[PDB]
Each structure stands twice: as C-alpha cells, then as structure tokens.
C-alpha cells in the first residue's frame with residue numbers, strides 16, 4: 001500500500017494493544033507532505049493488527065478516522081492514519097475541564113453522531129463506542145476510531161450478546177454523558193456487576209453539572225430498555241442540529 005521511504009517516524013506519543021503509537025510525516029510523489037499517526041507492530045496477531053486497517057479502509061466520512069495507508073510488504077508492519085493533534089476525547093476533555101462552552105461540546109457530539117449515522121447506514125455496528133475511542137483534531141473535530149465494555153454496553157447486548165445500531169445508540173448516550181462531564185468515568189467507582197444490576201433495576205446516570213436538560217433527556221432516550229424505543233442516529237443528529245440552531249433551548253439546566 002505505502003512505500004516505507006515515504007514515511008518518517010518522529011516522536012513516540014502513545015502505547016496501543018500491539019505496540020507503540022508515533023507521530024510522523026507521510027510524503028508521497030505528487031502530493032504535499034501530511035502529518036500522520038503511525039502504529040508499529042505471531043501471524044494471527046499480525047492479522048489482528050492489520051484487521052483494523054481493512055475495516056477503517058472501508059470508510060470515507062469527516063467524522064471517521066482517515067486511513068492514509070499500511071506498510072505490510074516490509075517490517076515493521078504499520079498502519080498510518082491522519083494525525084489527530086488533541087488525541088483521545090476523554091483525556092482531552094479532562095485536560096480542558098470546564099473550558100469549552102456548551103455549544104462547543106454539542107458541536108463535538110454532533111460530529112460523533114454524524115459518524116455513527118454513517119456507520120449505521122453502512123450496516124456497521126461498532127460495539128465499542130466510548131470517548132476513549134474518539135479522536136480530536138486541532139479544530140476540535142471529533143472522529144470515531146477503534147475498528148465487553150460493560151459500562152458502555154446496552155443491557156440486551158450484555159445479557160444476550162445482541163449487538164445492533166440500537167445498542168450503539170445506548171453507548172452514544174454514555175458518550176454524551178462523558179462529554180458533558182468533561183471525561184468523568186461513567187458510574188464512577190461502581191463495579192461492573194453493580195452497573196449491570198443498577199441498570200436492570202432502572203438506575204440511569206444523572207445530568208452532569210451544568211448539563212442542559214434537553215441533552216440529558218436525549219441521553220435518557222438513548223438508554224431506554226426497549227431498544228426499538230431508542231432514537232436512531234439520523235434522529236440524534238437532527239435533534240442536535242435543532243439545539244444548535246435554536247441555542248436558547250440549551251439554557252434550561
């Protein structure tokens with residue numbers, strides 16, 4: 001896919017499941033240089049590493065991480081994506097706690113919902129939608145990546161392993177809560193089993209401090225026990241668009 005000579009690996013910036021994550025530069029003939037993130041890498045594990053790229057490579061949308069390419073005819077094996085300067089959304093928000101406006105946070109959430117709308121339209125169920133799996137660029141554009149997390153997972157998906165775009169809608173509601181809380185951990189220190197039991201017994205997370213009531217009600221809609229009752233992602237995006245166009249709605253807390 002990509003000639004290794006076109007890749008310049010700079011600073012190590014993270015650790016992933018199979019190895020390091022680096023910042024670097026991609027420069028192909030006829031194209032301007034671009035800034036990339038690079039994951040560097042068993043066989044079964046090699047196919048497990050590269051599977052992320054083949055899934056990612058199916059997609060083209062401004063809120064889904066762009067695959068720039070792979071290095072697989074050389075070693076180390078590599079996956080290159082567009083560089084997302086602010087990294088993962090949960091830790092980015094914790095660093096900036098209280099420092100973005102409600103309208104900014106809704107804009108982030110709208111971008112995440114558009115991504116998910118596109119995945120669902122493609123019949124792709126994510127199963128691992130969480131703030132930690134969303135990356136943020138220098139213009140605050142949020143992009144879904146990562147291609148059972150109990151506290152993010154719908155009760156029917158936990159109980160019956162039934163994963164659908166409607167179980168992703170449940171997870172999206174949890175991401176809304178993460179965002180509006182500036183990256184707090186869902187259900188704080190409750191154990192996984194306590195979370196399962198609480199949800200089955202009708203507990204739902206409360207509105208984060210300063211959270212508009214209209215956003216918390218959207219979270220509650222996403223967390224309906226009946227999966228058919230949850231909003232689909234087009235309705236989620238349209239709900240956020242209405243809130244953005246009519247921002248007075250976001251003042252009631």
Ligand SMILES: COc1cc2c(Nc3c(Cl)ccc4c3OCO4)ncnc2cc1OCCCN1CCCCC1
Pocket residue numbers: 013014015021036037038039052079080081082083084085086087088135145146
């Ligand atoms: C782990 O930090 C970053 C990961 C990024 C990333 N990850 C990624 C995924 Cl999720 C999936 C496949 C990939 C891949 O890289 C190449 O192949 N992709 C793109 N950009 C990333 C940026 C990352 O961190 C940016 C540095 C953030 N840092 C700035 C200084 C203060 C702390 C946060």
